[PDB]
Design a protein around this ligand. Sequence first.
Ligand code: HEM
Length: 291
Amino acid sequence: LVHVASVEKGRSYEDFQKVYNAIALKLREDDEYDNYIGYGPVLVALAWHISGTWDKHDNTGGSYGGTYRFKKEFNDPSNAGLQNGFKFLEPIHKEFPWISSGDLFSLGGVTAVQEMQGPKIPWRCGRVDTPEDTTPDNGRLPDADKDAGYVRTFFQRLNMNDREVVALMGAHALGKTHLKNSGYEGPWGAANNVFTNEFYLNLLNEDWKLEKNDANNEQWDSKSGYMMLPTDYSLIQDPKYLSIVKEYANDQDKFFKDFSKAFEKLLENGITFPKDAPSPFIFKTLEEQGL
Ligand code: HEM
């Protein structure tokens, strides 16, 4: 099963920058969402879950098909809450009906990271909508109540290694858990709509206490009012993971570089880019444009 990137007919860089700008302007505008966190975090969670269904063994799932738009996938329990990012992006698809669904979903994650002051994330167009019967079954995304062995195995399905797994998990500096969505409740840090190395710092520097939440699930809670999932806490339980956690706590630029490569790879898993496709695009922020 091969998925070959196909550029939207006649579109170039400047066209996609417009779609970026529209997402970015709307991010600016809808600042009240989720108690003033804004929609940045749910947008990067949506781009991760639509890519996270990939299976490297048979190339099923992945971001290419746009299959999150079908009821079997948006009804995935693992995706509870992400209907809000989809709803956000609907006016944008309306304004730019020529972009594919996979391209829009994935571009929404890139746009969110950069406007929340994270690193630049190169992005490539050419995902093509596939039909309903290519929608992967539920159950392909990761459980939160497991340990580092589980996490390591899980991410190997996505062809991610130790550094990649730890870099990628740093996105949990953003947003928060919601009891009615996941059975977990609370934020990971204080600046949860700015992209920083705070997750790593909080992991190492906080006083964590293991507790049961109101949904009867175990989670780690700090005196500062922060939390960590069991899978998050894994990263300082495994010695290999802990080494890298310290690295990123100590050096945000290194974390930024590694996240950037890892997020692009995650969003492009399963896609074949022809030799003569366009080079990855690096979009300007609104700020960089005076907008
Ligand atoms: C072992 C892997 C991980 C587990 C078990 C997992 C689990 C969770 C859980 C349960 C939530 C809260 C959902 C809610 O209640 O609304 C959460 C949210 C979040 N996750 Fe993860 N996650 C994983 C990895 C990742 C990765 C790789 C990324 C992206 C690069 C990511 C991005 C985020 C973000 C940004 C949110 C916050 C969204 C918002 O506030 O609504 N997660 N995750």
